[PDB]
Design a binder for these strands. Structure first.
Ligand SMILES: [Mg+2]
Ligand SMILES: [Mg+2]
Ligand SMILES: [Mg+2]
Ligand SMILES: [Mg+2]
Ligand SMILES: [Mg+2]
Ligand SMILES: [Mg+2]
Ligand SMILES: [Mg+2]
Ligand SMILES: [Mg+2]
Ligand SMILES: [Mg+2]
Ligand SMILES: [Mg+2]
Ligand SMILES: [Mg+2]
Ligand SMILES: [Mg+2]
Ligand SMILES: [Mg+2]
Ligand SMILES: [Mg+2]
Ligand SMILES: [Mg+2]
Ligand SMILES: [Mg+2]
Ligand SMILES: [Mg+2]
Ligand SMILES: [Mg+2]
Ligand SMILES: [Mg+2]
Ligand SMILES: [Mg+2]
Ligand SMILES: [Mg+2]
Ligand SMILES: [Mg+2]
Ligand SMILES: [Mg+2]
Ligand SMILES: [Mg+2]
Ligand SMILES: [Mg+2]
Ligand SMILES: [Mg+2]
Ligand SMILES: [Mg+2]
Ligand SMILES: [Mg+2]
Ligand SMILES: [Mg+2]
Ligand SMILES: [Mg+2]
Ligand SMILES: [Mg+2]
Ligand SMILES: [Mg+2]
Ligand SMILES: [Mg+2]
Lengths: 145, 70, 80, 141, 60, 67, 63, 143, 55, 206
RNA sequence: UAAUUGCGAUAACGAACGAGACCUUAACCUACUAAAUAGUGGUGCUAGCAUUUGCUGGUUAUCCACUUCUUAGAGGGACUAUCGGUUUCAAGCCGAUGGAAGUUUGAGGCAAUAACAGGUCUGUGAUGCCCUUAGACGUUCUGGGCCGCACGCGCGCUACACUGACGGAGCCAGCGAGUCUAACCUUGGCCGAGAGGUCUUGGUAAUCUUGUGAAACUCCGUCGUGCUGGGGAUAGAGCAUUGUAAUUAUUGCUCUUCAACGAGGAAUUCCUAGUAAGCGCAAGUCAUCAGCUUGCGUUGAUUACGUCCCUGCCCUUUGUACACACC
């Protein structure tokens, strides 16, 4: 690309969505150390934010970071498809969320709880510390808990 | 993490005054000179060829190779 | 009807006919013969019908509980 | 009708046919120049005959080749074989014997089979292993 | 060539031996320009057990 | 291992025994001979025979051979 | 250091329990007219050249 | 001398034509570009981000020039590769028919290819024209 | 029913994990009988007359 | 060299070196000699070659392996460790690169340097596990030339690969490093070490 | 010698089963007979680029000729040929040249005598005897189960990356198979991010799917040694396909979650040339489901060409109180 320069400008390590993000990684991937931002999500969000992915987490204006967040937590508004999203069709309000960061933990809790509370086999199965997607349990996973 | 991902002006000048005697320069050599990781070191490869020192004698992905200018 | 037709047809000497000679043993034994008489006879008759050689095996069980087999060959055969 | 021969070349299952006629000196493969080819590392393998026998040689002749079958390396060996075989087939009907035999000489000498087809071929797998010789795996008990 | 590939055993025991049968199917065609008489003659006869003879017509 | 079976060696014996003039340390013609002069059922076996009878001749030429 | 070169002149056979060793008579080069028997480690034919590391000493059997 | 594209090596051609279609500004880029993948058999989207639709455009075009006719199916089969089914063996998989079909419709509206009889898409005569032209251009940089 | 199954402690994984494993888990083939294979148990025997009548 | 051309034309350096000398990727086969008597006969060099690829029938007979051009033997031995089995195009290119690299450092026909690290790595003598009774001593043996070349190639590429594993230096670079350190023997190469040690124990047990 | 395959020795001589021969498939035929269900050259109709001829296509018949390539009938071909080393100058073995081919030409099919309480009564309307036979052990219908999970063992798939992953682009196989009283193989057109949908279509097939444009692979980029962009287990949400039925999730897709695994102890499998290994495909099963098999082609090595050390087995000699034969 090009031999670059800058000064004190870029500060290593920076904190968004209640987590931490290393500088000196290629930004797209920096965003990944947040919960709920697989490489795709990050990629598209960054493209939508109008950022140079060739940049590290390193550079990036404060502004830029702000936009990045805004879109990250309002995908549907900044035309991101919705099949791109980890939580479409809630199951109560039925909206589509892309649940992020410290909140995806909650949402997992929530769902598992709903299953348990309703006595559904999947729930019981979870509660029992077993595999739920129907795999044979004779042979695999014995290192286990 | 362990370093060489930016440019620290002193580093740039370092690159300009350290790259003769390097009969061999490549992605690997630049890293080995305790600096630039294979991202920005590739840029260094493109940009010493901006004009000067490095003489392109081999071609591609993975392998690059240059020699001191004459 | 009539788009299919059957004809019988005597066979030129049943003597070189594995299938005929098997059925013949079946009948000899079933018609209450002896064992060696039946077999040796079939064989001597196949031979007599001008064969190069022939062999009759009887396997299974006769009269005693335990099973047995018997080869009854004459003439010449090739196997491979 | 001008002077012209056809030949072919064969490595594994690939086969490469050559049409070698009187021309102003082309050397094309399927429909591109023999300079393209790529495999690329292997490129010289197909130049190989021309340089073994002097680049001139092809000035009274047009050359075209088309390979189907085999795979990438497979096709390179076939096309080169077809080309050298070609050139010799042509000196045999139009030029004189001594010339042809001088060409067979310089190919056959250095060689890489150029005139003669490699007989190596697949051996069939047999039940009890993923390969032909490879047997599966046993534990005893 | 029609291959059928089966275990030899009727059960399961024994090293797993496989066996493979074939029925070879040979097909041919001869194109002929003639009148009705010769086709009918030639094709009612030339009859043969095992050989499947089919006569078509036309150009479509 | 290329060792000739009985039937082959036996046949070379008998042929050389009874057709030594005709036959000639050349396989190519001893072959054709074998065709015209004896009755075999496979090309292969006939060749094998000729080639061995050719060998046997080729060495009789320089002193006798037992059998 | 004193290298000594010897030419294989005769292949004797395989020794060693496993049988991968080969006994050979070699005529050394810098002054023939003298033969020694060594034991190989690789595949060997008539006229190859061994570097006897030590010039005088020779073996026979091998279990 | 006279020219075709067959006289020009794959890459520098298709990149020449990439840069061209790019420059041009006439095209059609669906819009879902950048937000899209190229095949279910893939992990990440293309790295060319702005562009690559031009890259595939070029590629597709040259592929159609070099033969009679081709459809969306054949391109999906072409542009597709191995998908890691994770921990279970790899299997070839076809690429997306949208990307391709849309690409065809694009080059067609730009008159560089045309619905063929027989089926599929035949290179346009004006496609012949323009492709032979930039081919020539690419050998001209090399002079 | 399902209320039962989730409410039942003495169930689920942790509980098993904490139990010792029996030794017949890590057992061996068994075999039982083989050097009797040639030794007929029927205790019956045939007899030269019956065999000679048969064969 | 007298240029010539026809319809579809043939590039300059191409025509040039092609018809003239019969040299490598583009390195000299003339000159280039085997600095250890013996080993000649088991290190090829002439007939000369364009690239180290060949539909070679070098196996079907006990010794004809010898006749295969050395450089191609090296590249061959490159293409192993399961993942890489087959994959000769990979290997070949790795060699072209390697030779360019080696050339950069200290000149020499790099194919001459290769020839040297091969000469300089085969164990002049070694050992085998003779019985002699349960507690098996070790009978010193003098090893064949063929085994010496073989094992030299084996060692060189192994060490080069093991080095190259899990670091930024690329196969051709570390292969060239091993080649160079070995060509004029310097106990900083995995190869030279292993040779020196084999012969250390082989002395130690005679 | 692969071989009781041969030579030779010889109270033996000369033979037959089995090995070999035979058969099938892979290799070679500018020799034979041919082909719009295979293709080549010429010609017309015609596109583009150069223009000086030229170069690259279109056109199941616009005609003419051909059989190199493809098809399959008939032949021919090789007999370890020629020469030379070696051997009791025997059968043979080795090297060189020639050769499509010289390891039984490569690979299979067939395959004697005898043995086993090997497996199969759960393939059979093969079958003895025993059991059972209307509150059935006959049969069918609904629903569950063979998948259940502290854990021991086997075959496997995918990995630990830089001879790499990702992304463009290049772009090449062979063996198969497909719908009648039916819904099978499916091109093409549109719609759809995808999976898929929808309208038409060719094929009972060298004719159509299909040149099955397969994957490894090649090239130009991105990443840069960081459990990393290696790896993709586990899990959440949504969308479709087969099916009367998908919950314990048939399968397919999208987003998200991102485990162990940093080359694997003692041990142990397989393998000698287009082989090993890598790589995909078709066929079987099949409504739907291949991480399995059976075949297939693509890319294509390193190392022996030896021995009896381990193991296994055959053979002599020898002992036997065994012969239902060391169970
Ligand atoms: Mg993430
Ligand atoms: Mg027989
Ligand atoms: Mg295979
Ligand atoms: Mg593809
Ligand atoms: Mg691709
Ligand atoms: Mg045998
Ligand atoms: Mg003119
Ligand atoms: Mg004109
Ligand atoms: Mg023909
Ligand atoms: Mg030869
Ligand atoms: Mg055969
Ligand atoms: Mg049964
Ligand atoms: Mg019963
Ligand atoms: Mg059944
Ligand atoms: Mg029956
Ligand atoms: Mg019952
Ligand atoms: Mg089961
Ligand atoms: Mg087990
Ligand atoms: Mg098994
Ligand atoms: Mg790729
Ligand atoms: Mg949609
Ligand atoms: Mg129809
Ligand atoms: Mg095909
Ligand atoms: Mg790690
Ligand atoms: Mg991945
Ligand atoms: Mg279910
Ligand atoms: Mg269950
Ligand atoms: Mg990761
Ligand atoms: Mg390992
Ligand atoms: Mg199922
Ligand atoms: Mg299937
Ligand atoms: Mg199964
Ligand atoms: Mg006694």
């Amino acid at each position: 690309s090009l031999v670059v320069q800058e000064q004190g400008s870029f500060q290593h390590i920076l904190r968004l969505l209640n987590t931490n993000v290393d500088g000196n990684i290629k930004i797209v991937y920096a965003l990944t150390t947040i919960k709920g931002v697989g490489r795709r999500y990050s990629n598209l969000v960054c493209k939508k934010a109008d950022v140079d992915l060739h940049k590290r987490a390193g550079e990036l204006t404060q502004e830029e970071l702000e936009r990045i967040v805004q879109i990250m937590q309002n995908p549907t508004h900044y035309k991101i498809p919705a099949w791109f999203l980890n939580r479409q069709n809630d199951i109560t309000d039925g909206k589509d969320y892309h649940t992020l960061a410290n909140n995806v933990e909650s949402k997992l809790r929530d769902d598992l709880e709903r299953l348990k509370k309703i006595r559904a086999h999947r729930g019981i199965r979870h509660f029992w510390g077993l595999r739920v997607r129907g795999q044979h349990t004779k042979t695999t996973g014995r290192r286990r808990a | 993490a362990q370093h060489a991902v930016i440019l620290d002006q002193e580093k740039y000048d370092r690159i300009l005054k350290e790259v003769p005697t390097y009969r061999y320069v490549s992605v690997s050599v630049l890293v080995d000179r305790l600096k630039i990781g294979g991202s920005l070191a590739r840029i260094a490869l493109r940009h010493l060829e901006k004009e000067g020192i490095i003489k392109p004698i081999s071609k591609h992905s993975k392998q690059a190779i240059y020699t001191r200018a004459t | 009807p009539g788009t299919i037709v059957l004809y019988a047809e005597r066979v030129q000497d049943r003597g070189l006919s594995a299938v005929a000679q098997a059925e013949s043993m079946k009948f000899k034994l079933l018609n209450g013969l002896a064992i060696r008489r039946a077999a040796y006879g079939v064989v001597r008759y196949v031979m007599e019908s001008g064969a190069k050689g022939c062999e009759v095996v009887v396997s299974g069980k006769l009269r005693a509980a335990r099973a047995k087999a018997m080869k009854f060959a004459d003439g010449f055969l090739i196997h491979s | 009708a001008v002077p012209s021969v056809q030949t072919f070349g064969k490595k594994k299952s690939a086969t490469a046919v050559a049409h070698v006629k009187a021309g102003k000196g082309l050397i094309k493969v399927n429909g591109s120049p023999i300079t393209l080819v790529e495999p690329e590392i292997l490129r010289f393998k197909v130049y190989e005959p021309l340089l073994l026998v002097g680049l001139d040689k092809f000035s009274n002749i047009d050359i075209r080749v088309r390979v189907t079958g085999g795979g990438h390396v497979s096709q390179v060996y076939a096309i080169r074989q077809a080309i050298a075989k070609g050139l010799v087939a042509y000196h045999q009907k139009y030029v004189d014997e001594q010339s042809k035999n001088e060409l067979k000489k310089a190919f056959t000498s250095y060689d890489r089979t150029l005139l003669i087809a490699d007989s190596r071929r697949p051996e069939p797998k047999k039940f009890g292993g993923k390969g032909a010789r490879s047997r599966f795996q046993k534990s005893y008990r | 060539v029609l291959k059928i590939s089966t275990r030899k055993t009727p059960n399961g025991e024994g090293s797993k031996t496989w066996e493979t049968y074939e029925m070879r199917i040979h097909k041919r065609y001869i194109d002929l320009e003639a009148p009705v008489q010769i086709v009918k003659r030639i094709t009612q006869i030339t009859i043969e057990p095992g050989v499947d003879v089919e006569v078509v017509v036309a150009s479509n | 291992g290329r060792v000739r079976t009985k039937t082959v060696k036996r046949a070379s014996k008998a042929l050389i025994e009874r057709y030594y003039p005709k036959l000639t340390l050349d396989f190519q013609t001893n072959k054709r001979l074998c065709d015209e002069i004896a009755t075999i059922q496979s090309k292969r076996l006939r060749n094998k025979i000729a080639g061995y009878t050719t060998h046997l001749m080729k060495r009789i030429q320089k002193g006798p051979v037992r059998g | 250091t004193p290298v000594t070169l010897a030419k294989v002149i005769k292949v004797l056979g395989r020794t060693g329990s496993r049988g991968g060793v080969t006994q050979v008579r070699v005529e050394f080069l810098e002054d023939t007219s003298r033969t020694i028997v060594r034991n190989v480690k690789g595949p060997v034919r008539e006229n190859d050249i061994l570097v006897l590391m030590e010039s005088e000493r020779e073996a026979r059997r091998l279990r | 001398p006279g020219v075709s594209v067959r006289d020009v090596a794959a890459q520098d051609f298709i990149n020449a034509y990439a840069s061209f279609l790019q420059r041009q500004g006439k095209l059609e880029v669906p819009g879902y570009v950048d937000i899209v993948k190229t095949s279910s058999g893939n992990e990440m989207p293309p790295q060319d981000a702005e562009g690559w639709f031009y890259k595939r455009a070029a590629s597709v075009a040259r592929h159609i020039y070099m033969r009679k006719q081709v459809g969306v199916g054949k391109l999906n089969k072409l542009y597709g590769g191995a998908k890691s089914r994770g921990v279970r063996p790899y299997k070839h998989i076809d690429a997306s028919g949208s990307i391709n079909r849309k690409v065809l419709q694009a080059l067609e509206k730009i008159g560089i290819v045309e619905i063929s009889p027989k089926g599929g898409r035949r290179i346009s005569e004006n496609g012949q024209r323009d492709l032979d032209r930039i081919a020539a251009q690419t050998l001209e940089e090399d002079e | 029913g399902n209320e039962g199954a989730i409410r039942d402690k003495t169930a689920g994984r942790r509980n098993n994990r904490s139990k010792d494993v029996t030794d017949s888990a890590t057992t061996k083939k068994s075999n039982t009988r083989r050097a009797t294979d040639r030794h007929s148990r029927t205790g019956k025997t045939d007899t030269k007359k019956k065999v000679n009548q048969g064969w | 060299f007298t240029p010539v051309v026809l319809a579809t034309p043939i590039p300059e350096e191409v025509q040039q070196a092609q018809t003239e000398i019969k040299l490598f990727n583009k390195w000299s086969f003339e000159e280039v000699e085997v600095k250890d008597a013996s080993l000649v006969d088991y290190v090829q060099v002439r007939q000369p070659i364009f690239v180290a690829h060949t539909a070679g029938r070098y196996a079907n007979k006990r010794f004809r392996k010898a006749q295969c051009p050395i450089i191609e033997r090296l590249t061959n031995s490159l293409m192993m460790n399961g993942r890489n089995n087959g994959k000769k195009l990979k290997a070949v290119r790795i060699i072209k690169h390697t030779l360019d690299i080696i050339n950069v450092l200290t000149d020499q026909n790099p194919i001459q340097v290769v020839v040297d690290a091969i000469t300089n790595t085969g164990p002049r003598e070694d050992t085998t596990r003779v019985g002699g009774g349960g507690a098996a001593r070790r009978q010193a043996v003098d090893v064949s030339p063929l085994r010496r070349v073989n094992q030299a190639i084996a060692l060189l590429t192994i060490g080069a690969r093991e080095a190259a594993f899990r670091n930024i230096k690329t196969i051709a670079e570390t292969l060239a490093e091993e080649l160079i350190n070995a060509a004029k023997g310097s106990s900083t190469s995995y190869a030279i070490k292993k040779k020196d040690e084999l012969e250390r124990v082989a002395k130690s047990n005679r």
